[PDB]
Structure 1
Amino acid sequence: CSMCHVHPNYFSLLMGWMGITTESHLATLASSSQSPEAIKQLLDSGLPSLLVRSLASFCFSKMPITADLVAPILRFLTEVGNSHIMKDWLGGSEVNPLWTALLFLLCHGLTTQQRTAIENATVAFFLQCISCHPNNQKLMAQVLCELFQTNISGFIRRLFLQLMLEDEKVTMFLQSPCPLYKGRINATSHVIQHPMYGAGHKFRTLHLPVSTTLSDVLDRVSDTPVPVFHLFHKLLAGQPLPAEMTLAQLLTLLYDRKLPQGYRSIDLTVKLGSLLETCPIQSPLQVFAGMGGLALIAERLIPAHSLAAFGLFLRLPGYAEVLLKERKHAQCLLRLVLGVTDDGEGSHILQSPSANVLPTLPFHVLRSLFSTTPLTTDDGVLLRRMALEIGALHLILVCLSALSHHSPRDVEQALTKQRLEEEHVTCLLQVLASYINPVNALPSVLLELLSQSCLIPAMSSYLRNDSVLDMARHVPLYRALLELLRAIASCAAMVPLLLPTSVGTLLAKMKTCVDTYTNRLQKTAEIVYAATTSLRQANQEK
């Protein structure tokens, strides 16, 4: 490859020797054709047509192709797809059928080993093509959606789990005027890369996830960490890169610095001696969900109730935008509901550090969606219609009945169960409050489904007790209850659920009791109670 890079005509001599103008021939051609200027000469003779026509003909079931030969040629396309010039062409018009063709092969003499090799090669090829090229993301999303439209199992689920639902790794090439000793061993180790990366103690190549930061890179490349290390780039000349910047921000900055998209590696100079608010770039899952493909997945489909609630909530339009704010939690929930126990990166979702937030997360994100979706526009009314059609309220009421033991008309383990049940009840009440008040909107089934349900009996049971210290500790629970009552009072059309023991009378009774206690001698709870008392008094006469 280096020899061909020095002498362009040697590449033509190589191709003539090849006979174009087996596995060994193909691999040698792939490796030797990596020069920035020899690649265009390779592409102009026999590169596209033969391979694309052959693979298309094989898919439909033109040089003859056997089952065994399919994998090596696709591996060749994988290996040559490193330069940006090649990667752009892979998204061209004539290559568009290819992807769909492969799906037709993998969605239905192909032995087990042959099928496994073909599917692994196709997954690798698609992952490489979609690595860091935003332009190809739209094409891939369109292909996936048109396959979906015209439950899920088989190779398609595997592709969804691999290409999506996981973070992306990128290659960084670090060079410094001083040697880098960390990460090396005294034993022999044959590591071979492209000659452009060089050899010695002054160069390093790291294939690492984009979620890391610059401090992680410095720790992984140098053991030394005002003597510090500054990472420079040619495009951002003279500007030291803060260590707190993430790789996503790096990619966004370089891409807005007219760097060719999908370029093979990011170059940094590690010298020895306004950008913190840069927005990260969009993940492939974000691009796919931008067009609304997650709802199709939801409709096309270990606490069973929580998973069922999450799956039902996924059907609502606009759920994806709110849910994908936290990539890790969203992907963990999607993998868990997809029937996979672990993310495949070496950890179990049950063992994830965010395990305490997962059980209540669907309710919190649904409440956020309710608060962030105004009812003035048609989006609100369509969301209400869809929610009533799919019976999300029915499931919420069933869960409330099961948890509160109010049928519609180990000691330590018991304590843990009651505490988590209280938290679940608080979350459900907050969700209902946000549903009723976002800050012909009244369904016909509403003002009737709430009646005879567990809502009124549950509120009556919770507010019936009127001591001053036994239940004064449940500040967040009563804050949520009073917020729900305020939301009830906000909507006039459903107020008569309160008007005819009495909510207002005994509520004012505890208000007077706490006022007398204050006069004779938790502030947030009492002031919220006073505000709810005032609002209930105002809505009581109206």
Structure 2
Amino acid sequence: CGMHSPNIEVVLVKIGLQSTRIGLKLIDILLRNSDSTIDILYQLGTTQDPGTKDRIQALLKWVSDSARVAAMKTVEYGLLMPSPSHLHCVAAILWHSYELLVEYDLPALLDQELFELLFNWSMSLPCNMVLKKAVDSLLCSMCHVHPNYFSLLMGWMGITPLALTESHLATLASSSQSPEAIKQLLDSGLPSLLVRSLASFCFSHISSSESINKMPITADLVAPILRFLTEVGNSHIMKDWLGGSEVNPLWTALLFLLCHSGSTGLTTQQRTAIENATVAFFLQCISCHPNNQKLMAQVLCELFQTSPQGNISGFIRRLFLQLMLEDEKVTMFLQSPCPLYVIQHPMYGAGHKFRTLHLPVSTTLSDVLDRVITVPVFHLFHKLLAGQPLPAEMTLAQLLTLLYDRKLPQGYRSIDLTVKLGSRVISLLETCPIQSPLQVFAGMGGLALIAERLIPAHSLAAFGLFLRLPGYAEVLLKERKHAQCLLRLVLGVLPTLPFHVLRSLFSTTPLTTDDGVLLRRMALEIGALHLILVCLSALSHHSPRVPRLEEEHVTCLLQVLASYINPVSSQNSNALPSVLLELLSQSCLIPAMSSYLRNPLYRALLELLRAIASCAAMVPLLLPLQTSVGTLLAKMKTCVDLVPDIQKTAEIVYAATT
């Protein structure tokens, strides 16, 4: 069938929707006696005809028979075990029948006994296979159709002591994803009692470790119920509720539990479980939510500010290497009448005509559309935009900023686009991108805080010292991918960038403002000039005056020095202290300059010369300790004789020397 399968499925759909009896018979022989069967069931269930009610009745009768067969324990083989993909397809069919305007009374088909049967089926088997996920997606769709069914489900597990296994909470978290279920769950006291219980357990454990409506939570359920928190954090009002002072004890308690209380006893497997659940929670919280981004930035700055005086624990280290060093991932939803070529939420549809991806923000629309004369061309539209398409090279950060400026609520985890076919004959791109958690954390200088607590190797060692300066990260974040690659090389073009960011920061911070002089005096205090001078001494094989990659390194270091002397070149006399003058009189600048002269890089050296001649307080170092530099430079300029620049720089040096 692999060459003509669309034809077969289409003719099967037409024969099925010809009459009711034939469709019911073929449903029976396709379910009792693959992706294609999922598409067949979808097109049978969601297409509207007078025979739709009997078809969904047959589907419900089949799933009830399978639940019965699983409940007491030839034609019954399909009832001994059902395909979980078929159950997810039935859930999608019921969901799209509830969503679309149907002629029949859909909740009349749903029965409470079906709720009891599928609930007993759910606890009859463990959580490893996907059959539990399928029957739980069916439970979620049916309870979305019937809110009173979920309302009675709360009354079963003692909710208006308690003991819930991991499968119980798994079924509840799976079946709470629908808006009516999550509305009833917020209306129910189960989330409030669980967060109060886990906060009390954390506080009790902290009090026991530091001394060396409430309900006791054991050491096993806490990782699954933290995963419950991760799964419910998709709602934006959930993210706002987690941002209040009522919840903040959860954060502080979990951190004090997982840092101070080392190996009540925490075993390594459960510690890893809580560790991974907290990673998932942190990844879930700040997803497309700038408020959560600044919240985590403030929280991590407060933890790094009160770091003990020196070793960083494994959790905080891996959280730094994980949370803000991977690109932000958003949920992509694609609706299209044309074919576009795992269990997901029923908002995301089914079949190949509904697409759902979990993709990083940094990519553009051309890459996600490639992976999924009048010429038909794909065009992208939004439900909040009327009459204009979307550019192919526009990244998702720009789209997220446009939607957040277009009344889309903050924290909306899944963005939806419709693909249409237009004709081609053979402002939007200029918007600001998303801020991202990494740059938000770097906005208040958290990089210096984490540096204080922490290919040639000397450049990578000097990068950590260089990023301690304020304003370094703001100019560092201009190229995201290469900065992330450099941080990945730090944890354990590439050597040029730690100095190129310093040169650009020197050039963007002039001497006419307070930021430039503060940066220069902090560089004088922390000792960056000594490090770059001994690096130049080691690279040039020359010693200070005691009282192919190397060429690029020397050129870049000379460029850094030139941008340090004159920021405008890339009260000026008293803008720089004489400490730099007495420091440069000791180093190896003069002998290396004399060695290199007597032999881009020449252009950088001439820029350094006009920079060192531009500052009057930096002038008297040019006198050698007896040929002047101006006459020498004129001699080798006549020897060389680009040319107008060389002549202008030589004339400037000659004027400075005279």
| Cα separation, 2, equivalents of 1:497 and 1:304 | 32
Distance change in 2, residues 1:330/1:532 (3 Å) = farther
> Shift of the alpha carbon at 1:508?
1.9
> Shift of the alpha carbon at 1:257?
0.6
> Shift of the alpha carbon at 1:55?
2.1
**Unaligned runs of at least 5 residues, structure 1:** 182-190, 341-357, 410-418, 466-475, 516-520, 534-542
**Unaligned runs of at least 5 residues, structure 2:** 1-139, 204-212, 569-573
SS at match of 2:582: coil
| Cα separation, 1, equivalents of 2:449 and 2:327 | 22
> Shift of the alpha carbon at 1:302?
5.2
* Superposed CA offset, 1:456-480 (max 9, x none): 1111112224xxxxxxxxxx11111
| Cα separation, 2, equivalents of 1:121 and 1:393 | 45
Contact (CA 8 Å) 1:511, 1:529: kept in 2 or not? Answer: no
Distance change in 2, residues 1:165/1:3 (3 Å) = same
* Superposed CA offset, 1:329-355 (max 9, x none): 222222322339xxxxxxxxxxxxxxx
| Cα separation, 1, equivalents of 2:257 and 2:657 | 63
Contact (CA 8 Å) 1:479, 1:528: kept in 2 or not? Answer: no
SS at match of 2:603: helix
Distance change in 2, residues 1:242/1:527 (3 Å) = farther
Contact (CA 8 Å) 1:100, 1:143: kept in 2 or not? Answer: no
State, as a whole percentage, how many aligned pairs show the same letter. 100
> Shift of the alpha carbon at 1:359?
1.0
Task: State the TM-score, normalizing by the size of structure 1.
Answer: 0.83
Which aligned pairs between 1:422-433 and structure 2 lie closer than 5 A?
422-433=551-562
> Shift of the alpha carbon at 1:328?
1.4
* Superposed CA offset, 1:353-383 (max 9, x none): xxxxx11111111011111112222222221
Distance change in 2, residues 1:494/1:524 (3 Å) = closer
* Superposed CA offset, 1:105-141 (max 9, x none): 2223111111111111111111111111111112111
- RMSD over aligned CA atoms reads 2.8
Which aligned pairs between 1:180-259 and structure 2 lie closer than 5 A?
180-181=340-341, 191-221=342-372, 226-259=375-408
2:656 counterpart residue number: 531
> Shift of the alpha carbon at 1:200?
2.1
| Cα separation, 1, equivalents of 2:345 and 2:152 | 22
Establish whether residue 142 from structure 1 lines up as the match of residue 266 from structure 2: no
SS at match of 1:92: coil
| Cα separation, 2, equivalents of 1:197 and 1:464 | 71
> Shift of the alpha carbon at 1:483?
0.7
Contact (CA 8 Å) 1:479, 1:525: kept in 2 or not? Answer: no
Distance change in 2, residues 1:135/1:47 (3 Å) = farther
Distance change in 2, residues 1:177/1:380 (3 Å) = same
| Cα separation, 1, equivalents of 2:377 and 2:647 | 50
Distance change in 2, residues 1:389/1:72 (3 Å) = same
> Shift of the alpha carbon at 1:37?
3.6
Which aligned pairs between 1:358-507 and structure 2 lie closer than 5 A?
358-409=494-545, 419-439=548-568, 440-465=574-599, 476-499=600-623, 501-507=627-633
* Superposed CA offset, 1:141-200 (max 9, x none): 11111111124341111111111111122111111112224xxxxxxxxx3222222222
Distance change in 2, residues 1:193/1:483 (3 Å) = same
Distance change in 2, residues 1:522/1:379 (3 Å) = closer
Distance change in 2, residues 1:30/1:304 (3 Å) = same
> Shift of the alpha carbon at 1:292?
1.2
Deviates more, 1:40-49 or 1:124-133: 40-49
Distance change in 2, residues 1:192/1:300 (3 Å) = same
> Shift of the alpha carbon at 1:445?
1.9
Distance change in 2, residues 1:527/1:110 (3 Å) = same
Task: State the TM-score, normalizing by the size of structure 2.
Answer: 0.69
Distance change in 2, residues 1:462/1:30 (3 Å) = same
> Shift of the alpha carbon at 1:405?
1.1
| Cα separation, 2, equivalents of 1:234 and 1:2 | 24
* Larger of the two Rg values belongs to structure: 2
Distance change in 2, residues 1:514/1:219 (3 Å) = closer
SS at match of 1:526: helix
Establish whether residue 337 from structure 1 lines up as the match of residue 487 from structure 2: no
> Shift of the alpha carbon at 1:513?
4.3
| Cα separation, 2, equivalents of 1:302 and 1:98 | 44
Distance change in 2, residues 1:304/1:511 (3 Å) = closer
Contact (CA 8 Å) 1:482, 1:532: kept in 2 or not? Answer: no
SS at match of 1:37: helix
| Cα separation, 2, equivalents of 1:229 and 1:523 | 56
| Cα separation, 2, equivalents of 1:219 and 1:528 | 57
Contact (CA 8 Å) 1:323, 1:365: kept in 2 or not? Answer: yes
Contact (CA 8 Å) 2:401, 2:434: kept in 1 or not? Answer: yes
Contact (CA 8 Å) 1:478, 1:525: kept in 2 or not? Answer: no
- Larger RCO of the pair (alpha carbons < 8 Å, separation 6+): 1
SS at match of 1:447: helix
Distance change in 2, residues 1:512/1:25 (3 Å) = closer
| Cα separation, 2, equivalents of 1:243 and 1:301 | 42
> Shift of the alpha carbon at 1:24?
1.9
Contact (CA 8 Å) 1:486, 1:532: kept in 2 or not? Answer: no
Distance change in 2, residues 1:529/1:513 (3 Å) = farther
Contact (CA 8 Å) 2:637, 2:650: kept in 1 or not? Answer: no
Contact (CA 8 Å) 1:210, 1:246: kept in 2 or not? Answer: yes
| Cα separation, 2, equivalents of 1:369 and 1:176 | 47
Contact (CA 8 Å) 1:447, 1:494: kept in 2 or not? Answer: yes
